[PDB]
């Protein structure tokens, strides 16, 4: 990231702190938890609303020392009143703005917000799980501010969880108790906390909605797939992602050794000795080097992250992923709760930045063999069957004689988001009670209100609705500003938070009290649908056939001779 966005972000960081001191009140309050009393504070928004803020509620023991890479344990309760008037630190990670490592291993907290601690009725509880490829992200209000949602009468909760190698290391040897998915296990224990404690904050424990975007969406899906969380919540929203996205799991059991060696490990490749080194390494050295773990072959086969969710090698007490996600969908309790899913209109536009550094990537569309699903493609991507599959992809996205950046970014939308959604819907249909799934398509383009991810994708002055452009209309961030209430941006906040809260409440996203929705007939997807219908969200709201549907069926034809793997 540029020296200009660094000084610029530095200033907004200093502005956000003064604004945050400014928007604080003297009205502390205490609430009950099953671990003891917590002290919150009331806060202000740039729209002159106000909410109670409880930050830094621990939902697990700090996962330091001997707990590093291990499943989380419950935290130690306290007498007295714990201070929750400030945020704790985020998970150790690479700051995308600076490039430096920031954060702390003491990161397992959650934040609770609401405009009213004593509602006259129990409220819907919304749990947000942030994205960031499982390697970055946080529940800090400079990035995920509750200011828009607290206009509604809900209880909003933002959780953190272990990221990167600290969150997702995995070792084969059963004696060392590092099966993997530690970060996912964190989310589970947070969900357990939210179930037993939301009532103390005016929340309805029997009406809980979990949602997230990108990695947060995959997380949400995992929380819907695993037995560990059965009946913990009652609605799910999958925003630009799920667990069968190709970036949302990896077998990384061999990569611990590599990481060890990058960090200066001396010795042999056995798990025990690898583990002992990594257990005493400085946290910020491990995280800084994660970028270098993937081999060139792996990057070639489109493996995005060295460490992430994984099929655990053996089953222990807190096992989350005992089988590949496709297999888990077949028994998943989550198939039987109301579900919303969606994407933006130009997902792949996010990859503008990446292309700018590697223009050679565009030549991959000359045969597109690199984007053939890995389970179907061959090691070297050279088999005649793989060139065939690559050609089907190519027909779907290369518009002219030579591929362009736009073809590439268009392909990415499908590789990373639309094709996986399609595969999931069809799989879910064969294994479900018949609970509705609703689709949306976020198609609202604006440059007048933005979020920090746009700094990273280099989305400055770039038309089209990229992956993460929707977050801006859900959460406040330190780059936002008060918008006139009649502006198209303000209306979109209202609509977006309106639909999400309506869905959270009833398991049905339609409301006539939401402006723009008066002609809308939002029907769920049926198994007998050849064509998906989605609510398309732009300046106006309109039910349409998913425009990506033809290209989606094209990708599906790659599985003509391998229908069992679809």
Coordinates of C-alpha atoms in Angstrom, one line a residue:
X1 CA 0.0 0.0 0.0
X2 CA 1.1 3.5 -1.0
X3 CA 3.0 6.0 1.2
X4 CA 0.1 8.4 0.6
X5 CA -2.6 6.1 2.0
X6 CA -0.3 5.4 4.9
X7 CA -0.1 9.0 6.1
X8 CA -3.8 9.5 5.1
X9 CA -4.8 6.4 7.1
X10 CA -2.6 7.6 10.0
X11 CA -4.5 10.8 10.1
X12 CA -8.0 9.1 10.0
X13 CA -6.7 6.9 12.8
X14 CA -5.9 10.0 14.9
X15 CA -9.3 11.5 13.9
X16 CA -11.2 8.3 14.7
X17 CA -9.7 8.4 18.2
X18 CA -10.7 12.0 18.9
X19 CA -14.2 11.4 17.4
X20 CA -14.4 8.3 19.6
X21 CA -13.5 10.2 22.7
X22 CA -16.0 12.9 21.6
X23 CA -18.8 10.4 20.9
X24 CA -18.5 8.9 24.4
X25 CA -20.8 9.6 27.3
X26 CA -20.5 9.4 31.1
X27 CA -23.4 7.0 31.3
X28 CA -21.8 3.8 32.3
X29 CA -24.0 0.8 33.0
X30 CA -23.5 -2.7 34.4
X31 CA -24.9 -5.9 33.0
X32 CA -24.9 -9.5 34.1
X33 CA -23.0 -12.3 32.4
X34 CA -22.6 -15.9 33.5
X35 CA -18.9 -15.1 34.2
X36 CA -19.7 -11.9 36.2
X37 CA -20.7 -8.3 35.9
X38 CA -19.6 -6.2 32.9
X39 CA -19.5 -2.4 32.7
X40 CA -20.5 -0.7 29.4
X41 CA -20.7 2.8 28.2
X42 CA -23.3 4.7 26.1
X43 CA -22.0 6.3 22.9
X44 CA -23.1 8.6 20.1
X45 CA -23.3 8.4 16.3
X46 CA -22.9 11.1 13.7
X47 CA -26.7 10.8 13.1
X48 CA -27.4 11.9 16.7
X49 CA -28.6 8.4 17.8
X50 CA -27.1 6.6 20.8
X51 CA -26.4 3.1 21.9
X52 CA -25.0 1.1 24.9
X53 CA -21.6 -0.4 24.1
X54 CA -20.0 -3.4 25.8
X55 CA -16.5 -4.1 24.3
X56 CA -13.8 -6.6 25.3
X57 CA -16.1 -9.2 26.7
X58 CA -13.9 -12.4 26.9
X59 CA -15.6 -15.6 25.7
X60 CA -12.5 -17.8 26.1
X61 CA -9.2 -18.0 28.0
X62 CA -6.5 -16.0 26.3
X63 CA -5.0 -18.6 24.0
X64 CA -1.4 -17.9 24.9
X65 CA 1.6 -20.0 25.9
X66 CA 0.6 -23.6 26.1
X67 CA -2.9 -22.9 24.6
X68 CA -1.4 -21.5 21.4
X69 CA -2.7 -23.5 18.4
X70 CA -5.1 -25.3 20.8
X71 CA -8.9 -25.3 21.0
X72 CA -10.2 -22.6 23.2
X73 CA -11.1 -23.1 26.9
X74 CA -13.8 -21.2 28.8
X75 CA -12.5 -18.0 30.5
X76 CA -12.0 -17.6 34.3
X77 CA -15.0 -15.9 36.0
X78 CA -14.4 -12.9 38.2
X79 CA -15.9 -11.2 41.2
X80 CA -16.5 -7.5 40.9
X81 CA -17.2 -5.4 37.8
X82 CA -15.1 -5.9 34.7
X83 CA -14.4 -2.8 32.6
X84 CA -15.8 -3.1 29.1
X85 CA -15.7 0.6 28.1
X86 CA -12.8 0.0 25.7
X87 CA -11.9 -2.3 22.8
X88 CA -9.3 -5.0 23.2
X89 CA -6.7 -5.7 20.6
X90 CA -7.3 -7.6 17.3
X91 CA -5.8 -11.0 16.3
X92 CA -2.1 -10.9 15.3
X93 CA -2.1 -10.1 11.6
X94 CA -0.5 -8.1 8.8
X95 CA -1.8 -4.5 8.6
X96 CA -2.9 -4.1 5.0
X97 CA -2.4 -0.4 5.2
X98 CA 1.2 -0.3 6.6
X99 CA 2.4 -3.9 6.0
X100 CA 3.6 -4.1 9.6
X101 CA 2.4 -6.7 12.0
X102 CA -0.1 -5.6 14.6
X103 CA -2.4 -7.2 17.1
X104 CA -2.0 -9.6 20.0
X105 CA -2.5 -13.2 20.9
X106 CA -4.9 -12.0 23.5
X107 CA -7.8 -11.4 21.0
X108 CA -10.7 -13.6 21.9
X109 CA -13.4 -11.1 22.8
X110 CA -16.8 -10.0 21.6
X111 CA -18.7 -6.7 21.6
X112 CA -22.4 -6.1 22.4
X113 CA -24.5 -3.1 21.3
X114 CA -28.1 -1.9 21.6
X115 CA -30.0 1.4 21.8
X116 CA -31.9 0.0 24.8
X117 CA -30.7 -2.2 27.6
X118 CA -34.2 -2.7 29.0
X119 CA -36.5 -3.2 26.0
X120 CA -40.2 -3.9 26.8
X121 CA -39.8 -7.1 24.7
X122 CA -36.9 -9.5 23.9
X123 CA -35.1 -8.3 20.7
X124 CA -33.7 -10.1 17.7
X125 CA -30.0 -10.9 18.2
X126 CA -27.6 -10.3 15.2
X127 CA -24.1 -11.8 15.4
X128 CA -21.6 -10.5 12.9
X129 CA -18.6 -12.5 11.9
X130 CA -16.0 -10.4 10.0
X131 CA -14.2 -11.6 6.9
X132 CA -10.6 -11.1 5.8
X133 CA -9.6 -14.5 4.4
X134 CA -9.2 -15.8 8.0
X135 CA -5.9 -13.8 8.1
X136 CA -7.1 -10.2 8.8
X137 CA -10.1 -8.5 10.5
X138 CA -11.4 -7.3 13.8
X139 CA -14.4 -6.2 15.8
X140 CA -13.1 -2.6 16.3
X141 CA -15.6 0.1 15.6
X142 CA -13.2 2.0 13.3
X143 CA -14.0 -0.8 10.9
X144 CA -17.3 -2.4 12.0
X145 CA -19.2 0.4 13.7
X146 CA -22.8 -0.5 15.0
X147 CA -24.1 3.0 14.3
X148 CA -26.4 2.0 11.5
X149 CA -27.9 -1.1 13.1
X150 CA -28.7 0.6 16.4
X151 CA -31.3 2.8 14.7
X152 CA -33.2 -0.5 14.7
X153 CA -34.4 -2.3 17.8
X154 CA -31.9 -5.2 17.7
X155 CA -29.0 -6.5 19.7
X156 CA -25.8 -6.5 17.5
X157 CA -22.8 -8.6 18.5
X158 CA -19.4 -8.5 16.7
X159 CA -17.0 -11.3 17.5
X160 CA -13.3 -11.9 17.0
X161 CA -11.5 -15.2 16.5
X162 CA -7.9 -16.4 16.0
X163 CA -6.5 -15.6 12.5
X164 CA -3.7 -17.1 10.3
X165 CA -1.4 -19.8 11.6
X166 CA -2.4 -19.1 15.2
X167 CA -6.0 -19.8 14.2
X168 CA -5.6 -22.6 11.7
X169 CA -2.4 -24.6 12.2
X170 CA -3.0 -28.3 11.7
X171 CA -0.8 -31.3 12.5
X172 CA -1.4 -35.0 11.6
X173 CA 0.1 -36.5 14.7
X174 CA -2.8 -37.2 17.1
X175 CA -0.7 -37.0 20.3
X176 CA -0.1 -33.2 20.0
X177 CA -3.7 -32.1 20.1
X178 CA -3.5 -29.6 17.2
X179 CA -6.1 -31.0 14.8
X180 CA -6.7 -27.6 13.3
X181 CA -9.6 -25.1 12.9
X182 CA -8.8 -23.4 16.2
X183 CA -10.2 -20.1 14.9
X184 CA -13.5 -21.9 14.0
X185 CA -13.6 -23.4 17.5
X186 CA -13.3 -19.8 18.8
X187 CA -16.4 -18.8 16.9
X188 CA -18.3 -21.8 18.3
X189 CA -17.5 -20.8 21.9
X190 CA -18.5 -17.3 21.2
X191 CA -21.8 -18.6 19.8
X192 CA -22.2 -20.6 23.0
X193 CA -21.6 -17.4 25.0
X194 CA -24.1 -15.4 23.0
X195 CA -26.8 -18.1 23.5
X196 CA -26.4 -18.1 27.3
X197 CA -25.9 -14.3 27.8
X198 CA -27.7 -12.2 25.2
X199 CA -30.9 -12.2 27.4
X200 CA -28.9 -10.0 29.9
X201 CA -28.7 -7.4 27.2
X202 CA -32.4 -7.4 26.1
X203 CA -31.8 -10.1 23.4
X204 CA -34.1 -13.0 22.6
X205 CA -32.1 -16.2 23.0
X206 CA -34.6 -18.0 20.8
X207 CA -34.2 -15.5 17.9
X208 CA -30.5 -15.3 16.9
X209 CA -29.2 -14.5 13.5
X210 CA -25.6 -15.1 12.4
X211 CA -24.2 -13.3 9.4
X212 CA -20.8 -12.5 7.8
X213 CA -19.1 -11.4 4.6
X214 CA -16.4 -13.3 2.6
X215 CA -14.4 -15.3 5.2
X216 CA -17.2 -14.3 7.6
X217 CA -19.7 -15.8 5.3
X218 CA -17.7 -19.1 5.1
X219 CA -17.5 -19.0 8.9
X220 CA -21.2 -18.4 9.2
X221 CA -21.8 -21.4 6.9
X222 CA -19.4 -23.6 9.0
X223 CA -21.4 -22.6 12.1
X224 CA -24.4 -23.9 10.2
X225 CA -22.7 -27.1 9.1
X226 CA -21.0 -28.4 12.3
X227 CA -22.8 -30.5 15.0
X228 CA -21.0 -28.4 17.6
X229 CA -23.4 -25.5 17.2
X230 CA -26.8 -27.4 16.7
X231 CA -29.7 -25.2 17.5
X232 CA -27.6 -22.3 18.7
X233 CA -29.2 -19.8 16.3
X234 CA -32.2 -19.6 14.0
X235 CA -31.4 -17.6 10.9
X236 CA -28.3 -17.4 8.6
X237 CA -27.0 -14.8 6.1
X238 CA -24.2 -15.7 3.7
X239 CA -22.8 -12.6 2.1
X240 CA -20.4 -13.3 -0.8
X241 CA -19.2 -16.7 0.4
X242 CA -19.7 -20.1 1.9
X243 CA -17.7 -23.2 3.0
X244 CA -17.4 -24.8 -0.4
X245 CA -15.8 -21.8 -1.9
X246 CA -12.4 -22.9 -3.1
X247 CA -10.6 -20.4 -0.8
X248 CA -12.6 -21.5 2.3
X249 CA -10.8 -24.6 3.2
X250 CA -7.3 -26.2 2.5
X251 CA -5.3 -29.2 3.7
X252 CA -2.4 -27.5 5.3
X253 CA -1.0 -30.3 7.5
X254 CA 2.3 -30.2 5.7
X255 CA 2.7 -26.4 5.7
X256 CA 3.5 -26.2 9.4
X257 CA 7.0 -27.5 8.7
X258 CA 7.5 -25.0 5.9
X259 CA 6.4 -22.2 8.2
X260 CA 8.8 -23.5 10.9
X261 CA 11.7 -23.5 8.4
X262 CA 11.0 -19.9 7.3
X263 CA 11.1 -18.9 10.9
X264 CA 14.5 -20.5 11.5
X265 CA 13.7 -24.0 12.6
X266 CA 16.6 -26.5 12.6
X267 CA 15.8 -30.2 12.5
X268 CA 13.6 -32.8 10.9
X269 CA 10.1 -32.9 9.5
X270 CA 8.2 -34.5 12.4
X271 CA 5.2 -32.8 13.9
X272 CA 6.4 -32.9 17.6
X273 CA 9.6 -31.0 16.8
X274 CA 7.9 -28.7 14.4
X275 CA 5.3 -27.9 17.0
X276 CA 7.8 -27.3 19.8
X277 CA 9.6 -24.7 17.6
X278 CA 6.4 -22.9 16.6
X279 CA 5.1 -22.9 20.2
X280 CA 8.0 -20.7 21.3
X281 CA 8.4 -18.5 18.2
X282 CA 7.4 -14.8 18.5
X283 CA 3.8 -14.4 17.4
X284 CA 4.6 -11.6 15.0
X285 CA 7.4 -13.6 13.3
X286 CA 5.1 -16.5 12.4
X287 CA 2.4 -14.1 11.0
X288 CA 4.8 -11.9 9.0
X289 CA 6.1 -15.1 7.2
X290 CA 2.8 -16.7 6.4
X291 CA 2.9 -14.8 3.0
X292 CA 5.9 -16.9 2.0
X293 CA 4.6 -20.4 2.9
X294 CA 2.7 -21.3 -0.3
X295 CA 4.7 -23.0 -3.0
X296 CA 4.6 -21.6 -6.6
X297 CA 2.6 -24.7 -7.6
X298 CA 0.0 -24.0 -5.0
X299 CA -0.3 -20.4 -6.1
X300 CA -0.6 -21.8 -9.6
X301 CA -3.5 -24.0 -8.6
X302 CA -5.2 -21.0 -7.0
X303 CA -4.6 -21.8 -3.4
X304 CA -5.1 -18.5 -1.7
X305 CA -4.1 -18.9 1.9
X306 CA -1.5 -21.3 3.5
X307 CA -3.5 -21.8 6.7
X308 CA -7.3 -21.9 7.0
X309 CA -10.2 -24.2 7.7
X310 CA -9.4 -27.9 7.1
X311 CA -10.6 -31.4 7.4
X312 CA -9.3 -32.3 10.8
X313 CA -7.0 -35.4 10.8
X314 CA -8.6 -37.0 13.8
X315 CA -11.6 -36.4 16.0
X316 CA -11.3 -34.8 19.5
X317 CA -13.6 -33.1 22.0
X318 CA -14.2 -29.9 20.1
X319 CA -13.8 -31.1 16.5
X320 CA -15.5 -28.7 14.0
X321 CA -14.8 -30.1 10.6
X322 CA -14.5 -33.9 10.6
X323 CA -15.3 -34.2 6.8
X324 CA -15.0 -32.1 3.7
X325 CA -17.6 -29.4 3.7
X326 CA -19.6 -31.0 0.8
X327 CA -20.0 -34.0 3.0
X328 CA -21.1 -32.0 6.0
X329 CA -23.9 -30.3 4.0
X330 CA -25.6 -33.6 3.7
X331 CA -26.4 -33.8 7.5
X332 CA -26.1 -30.2 8.5
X333 CA -28.6 -28.9 11.0
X334 CA -28.2 -25.5 9.4
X335 CA -30.0 -26.6 6.2
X336 CA -33.2 -26.4 8.3
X337 CA -33.1 -22.8 9.4
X338 CA -34.1 -19.8 7.2
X339 CA -31.2 -18.6 5.0
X340 CA -30.3 -15.7 2.9
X341 CA -27.4 -15.6 0.5
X342 CA -26.1 -13.1 -2.1
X343 CA -23.3 -11.5 -4.0
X344 CA -22.5 -8.2 -5.5
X345 CA -22.9 -7.4 -9.2
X346 CA -19.1 -7.3 -9.9
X347 CA -17.4 -9.5 -7.3
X348 CA -14.2 -10.0 -9.1
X349 CA -13.6 -6.3 -9.5
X350 CA -11.8 -6.7 -6.2
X351 CA -8.9 -8.3 -8.0
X352 CA -8.0 -5.0 -9.9
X353 CA -5.1 -4.5 -7.4
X354 CA -3.6 -8.0 -7.9
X355 CA -3.7 -7.7 -11.7
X356 CA -1.9 -4.4 -11.5
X357 CA 1.1 -6.2 -10.0
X358 CA 0.8 -9.3 -12.1
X359 CA -0.5 -8.5 -15.6
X360 CA 0.8 -11.9 -16.6
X361 CA -2.3 -13.4 -14.8
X362 CA -4.5 -12.2 -17.7
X363 CA -2.8 -14.7 -20.0
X364 CA -4.2 -17.5 -17.8
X365 CA -7.5 -17.1 -19.7
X366 CA -5.9 -18.2 -22.9
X367 CA -6.8 -21.8 -21.8
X368 CA -8.3 -21.1 -18.4
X369 CA -6.9 -24.4 -17.1
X370 CA -5.8 -22.8 -13.9
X371 CA -9.4 -22.0 -13.0
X372 CA -10.7 -25.5 -13.5
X373 CA -11.9 -26.8 -10.1
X374 CA -8.9 -28.5 -8.5
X375 CA -10.7 -31.8 -7.8
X376 CA -11.3 -32.2 -11.6
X377 CA -8.0 -30.8 -12.9
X378 CA -4.6 -32.6 -13.1
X379 CA -1.4 -31.7 -11.2
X380 CA 0.3 -30.0 -14.1
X381 CA -3.0 -28.8 -15.6
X382 CA -1.9 -30.4 -18.9
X383 CA -4.3 -33.3 -19.4
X384 CA -6.5 -33.1 -22.5
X385 CA -9.6 -33.4 -20.3
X386 CA -8.4 -30.3 -18.3
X387 CA -7.7 -28.2 -21.5
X388 CA -11.3 -29.2 -22.4
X389 CA -12.7 -28.1 -19.1
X390 CA -10.6 -24.9 -19.4
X391 CA -12.2 -24.2 -22.8
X392 CA -15.7 -24.3 -21.3
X393 CA -14.7 -21.7 -18.8
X394 CA -13.0 -19.7 -21.5
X395 CA -16.2 -19.6 -23.7
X396 CA -18.0 -18.2 -20.6
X397 CA -15.8 -15.2 -20.0
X398 CA -13.4 -14.3 -22.9
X399 CA -15.4 -11.9 -25.1
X400 CA -12.9 -11.4 -27.9
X401 CA -9.8 -12.8 -29.5
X402 CA -7.6 -12.0 -26.5
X403 CA -8.6 -12.1 -22.8
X404 CA -8.7 -8.8 -20.9
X405 CA -8.5 -7.7 -17.3
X406 CA -12.3 -7.4 -17.3
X407 CA -12.8 -11.0 -18.6
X408 CA -10.4 -12.0 -15.8
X409 CA -12.2 -10.1 -13.1
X410 CA -15.5 -11.5 -14.5
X411 CA -14.2 -15.0 -14.3
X412 CA -13.1 -14.5 -10.7
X413 CA -16.6 -13.5 -9.7
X414 CA -17.7 -17.0 -10.7
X415 CA -14.7 -19.0 -9.7
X416 CA -14.7 -17.5 -6.2
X417 CA -18.3 -16.8 -5.6
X418 CA -21.2 -17.6 -8.0
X419 CA -20.2 -21.1 -9.0
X420 CA -19.7 -22.1 -5.3
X421 CA -23.1 -20.7 -4.3
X422 CA -24.7 -22.7 -7.1
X423 CA -23.0 -25.9 -6.0
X424 CA -24.1 -25.3 -2.5
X425 CA -27.8 -24.6 -3.3
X426 CA -28.1 -27.7 -5.4
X427 CA -26.4 -29.9 -2.7
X428 CA -28.6 -28.3 0.0
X429 CA -31.7 -29.1 -2.0
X430 CA -31.0 -32.8 -1.8
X431 CA -30.6 -32.8 2.0
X432 CA -33.1 -30.4 3.5
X433 CA -36.4 -30.1 5.4
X434 CA -37.5 -27.5 2.9
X435 CA -36.7 -24.3 4.8
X436 CA -36.6 -21.3 2.5
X437 CA -33.4 -19.8 1.0
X438 CA -33.6 -16.3 -0.3
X439 CA -31.2 -14.7 -2.7
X440 CA -30.1 -11.1 -3.1
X441 CA -27.8 -9.3 -5.5
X442 CA -26.1 -6.1 -4.3
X443 CA -25.9 -3.7 -7.2
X444 CA -25.7 -0.3 -5.6
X445 CA -22.7 1.7 -6.9
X446 CA -21.4 4.7 -5.0
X447 CA -18.1 6.5 -4.5
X448 CA -19.5 9.2 -2.1
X449 CA -19.4 6.7 0.8
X450 CA -16.7 4.1 1.1
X451 CA -14.9 1.6 3.4
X452 CA -11.2 0.7 4.1
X453 CA -11.2 -2.4 1.9
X454 CA -11.5 -0.1 -1.1
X455 CA -8.0 1.2 -0.2
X456 CA -6.6 -2.3 -0.4
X457 CA -8.2 -3.4 -3.7
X458 CA -7.2 0.0 -5.0
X459 CA -10.8 0.7 -5.8
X460 CA -10.3 4.4 -5.7
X461 CA -12.2 5.9 -8.7
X462 CA -13.3 2.5 -10.0
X463 CA -16.8 2.0 -11.3
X464 CA -18.8 -1.2 -10.5
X465 CA -19.8 -2.9 -7.3
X466 CA -16.9 -4.9 -6.0
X467 CA -16.6 -7.5 -3.3
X468 CA -17.0 -5.7 0.1
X469 CA -18.7 -2.5 -1.3
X470 CA -21.8 -3.5 0.6
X471 CA -20.2 -3.3 4.0
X472 CA -20.3 0.5 3.8
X473 CA -24.1 0.3 4.1
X474 CA -24.0 -2.0 7.1
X475 CA -21.4 -0.6 9.3
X476 CA -19.8 2.7 10.2
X477 CA -16.1 3.0 9.6
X478 CA -13.5 5.8 10.2
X479 CA -13.7 6.8 6.5
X480 CA -17.5 7.4 6.6
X481 CA -19.3 10.7 7.1
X482 CA -22.9 11.8 7.9
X483 CA -24.9 11.6 4.7
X484 CA -28.0 13.7 4.0
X485 CA -31.1 11.6 4.8
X486 CA -32.5 12.0 1.3
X487 CA -29.3 10.8 -0.5
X488 CA -29.2 7.5 -2.4
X489 CA -26.5 6.3 0.0
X490 CA -28.6 7.0 3.2
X491 CA -31.6 5.2 1.7
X492 CA -29.4 2.2 1.0
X493 CA -28.2 2.1 4.6
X494 CA -31.8 2.2 5.6
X495 CA -32.9 -0.5 3.2
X496 CA -29.9 -2.8 3.9
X497 CA -30.1 -2.6 7.7
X498 CA -33.9 -2.8 7.2
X499 CA -34.0 -6.0 5.3
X500 CA -31.3 -7.7 7.4
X501 CA -33.2 -6.8 10.6
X502 CA -36.5 -7.9 9.1
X503 CA -35.0 -11.3 8.0
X504 CA -33.5 -11.7 11.5
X505 CA -36.8 -11.2 13.1
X506 CA -39.1 -13.3 10.9
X507 CA -37.0 -15.5 8.7
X508 CA -38.5 -13.6 5.8
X509 CA -36.7 -10.5 4.2
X510 CA -39.7 -8.8 2.7
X511 CA -41.2 -5.8 4.4
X512 CA -43.6 -3.2 2.9
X513 CA -42.3 -0.8 5.6
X514 CA -39.0 -0.7 3.8
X515 CA -39.0 2.0 1.2
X516 CA -38.7 0.7 -2.4
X517 CA -40.1 -2.7 -1.6
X518 CA -43.8 -1.9 -2.4
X519 CA -43.8 -3.9 -5.7
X520 CA -41.5 -6.6 -4.5
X521 CA -42.5 -10.3 -4.5
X522 CA -39.4 -11.9 -3.0
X523 CA -39.9 -15.7 -3.3
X524 CA -37.4 -18.2 -2.0
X525 CA -35.5 -20.6 -4.4
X526 CA -37.2 -24.0 -5.0
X527 CA -35.4 -27.2 -6.1
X528 CA -37.5 -27.2 -9.3
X529 CA -36.0 -23.8 -10.4
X530 CA -33.8 -23.9 -13.4
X531 CA -33.3 -20.2 -13.0
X532 CA -32.5 -18.4 -9.7
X533 CA -34.5 -15.3 -8.8
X534 CA -32.8 -12.7 -6.6
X535 CA -33.8 -9.3 -5.2
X536 CA -31.5 -7.0 -7.1
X537 CA -30.5 -4.0 -4.9
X538 CA -29.6 -0.8 -6.7
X539 CA -31.2 2.7 -6.7
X540 CA -34.4 0.7 -7.0
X541 CA -35.2 -2.7 -5.7
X542 CA -36.3 -5.2 -8.4
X543 CA -36.8 -9.0 -8.5
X544 CA -34.9 -10.5 -11.4
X545 CA -33.5 -13.7 -12.8
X546 CA -29.9 -13.9 -11.7
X547 CA -27.9 -12.5 -14.6
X548 CA -24.9 -14.7 -13.8
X549 CA -27.1 -17.8 -14.4
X550 CA -25.9 -18.7 -17.9
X551 CA -22.2 -18.5 -17.0
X552 CA -23.1 -20.5 -13.8
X553 CA -24.5 -23.4 -16.0
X554 CA -21.4 -23.2 -18.2
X555 CA -19.2 -23.9 -15.2
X556 CA -21.5 -26.7 -14.2
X557 CA -21.1 -28.4 -17.6
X558 CA -17.5 -29.1 -16.6
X559 CA -19.0 -31.8 -14.4
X560 CA -20.9 -33.5 -17.3
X561 CA -18.7 -36.7 -17.0
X562 CA -18.2 -36.3 -13.2
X563 CA -21.6 -35.6 -11.9
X564 CA -20.7 -37.3 -8.5
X565 CA -18.2 -34.5 -7.7
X566 CA -20.7 -31.7 -8.4

